[PDB]
């Protein structure tokens, strides 16, 4: 599924990300835009044998089990395929566990590169929330 901006915003809001652990909703809409362009089927293989999956491009080394990644931690305790849903619940639930890590949202390269330190509210303006 490719989500629209506000549509994604609405889903993230119902699923508890606005101000989760202090990050305003714009933070996550921003991360997804740059992680995957809002596409739930986004995949990206990496030199280390891992693969990023889904709308927030979650990595199979640490966060999910894909059956093929050396030394998988599977911290979200889920199959990476579950992150490929049109329904973003599993992605959201895992992203909250990642954001609850020491690094917070800086876990996402894209978010520290292009969302952190900017007017993240921009990403939800135009949306009635």
């Amino acid at each position, epitope marked *: 599924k490719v989500y629209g901006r506000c549509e994604l915003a609405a889903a993230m809001k119902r*699923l508890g*990300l606005d*101000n989760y652990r*202090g990050y305003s909703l714009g933070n996550w809409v921003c991360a997804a835009k740059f992680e995957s362009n809002f596409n739930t089927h986004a995949t990206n293989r990496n030199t280390d044998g891992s693969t990023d999956y889904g709308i927030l491009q979650i990595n199979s080394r*640490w966060w999910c089990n894909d059956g093929r990644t050396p030394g998988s931690k599977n911290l979200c305790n889920i199959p990476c395929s579950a992150l490929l849903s049109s329904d973003i*619940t599993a992605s959201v*639930n895992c992203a909250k*566990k990642i954001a609850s890590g020491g690094n917070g949202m800086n876990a996402w390269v894209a978010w520290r590169n292009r969302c952190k330190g900017t007017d993240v509210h921009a990403w939800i303006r135009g949306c009635r929330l």
Partner: antibody
Amino acid sequence: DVQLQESGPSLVKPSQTLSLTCSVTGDSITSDYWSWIRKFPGNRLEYMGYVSSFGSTFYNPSLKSRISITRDTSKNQYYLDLNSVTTEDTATYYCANWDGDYWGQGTLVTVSA
Amino acid sequence: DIVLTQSPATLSVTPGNSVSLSCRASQSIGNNLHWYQQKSHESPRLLIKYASQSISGIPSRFSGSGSGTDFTLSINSVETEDFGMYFCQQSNSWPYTFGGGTKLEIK
């Protein structure tokens, strides 16, 4: 399956450190986030803190600075160290995983002189 | 810190009957409200994740609902083994905080 279990002394004296271990079964501790929770007599649960995958720690501000949560990955153990304890620190102590799926059975540790 | 407040403190119901427990947060916590039941000489068991998400192996008479600040745990026709303490806990805000519990006793 996953199974957690607390151990350590059951008597503690004021200004002494109460120390507990949590021994983990059925997974690597380095494969999850792990927490310490205590229950006082008033059916009052307090979240003490947790430790993430690489040892990053989150402590409750209510703990008077007296807390540390360390771990030994080789032993599939993690620990609670609580400095300068009082009778107020009398509680039933549990370890659990961060998602709350699995908890130790709990261990009563009393403080009082 | 977020403060959770549950009502009533003690709830009495006759077996087979239906119940609804409340957990409320001082300020909004999104859907980041989890529910725990705790019997005598047992540790907590996770019943419901994120307001309304079902947990593997929990009996379907456990349902959770709400959002924002207002939350409810429903048990459909409670059973004798359902009597015990119920707690809500938030995860939207650090430090994580628990309700003061509700006691599910017999009438």
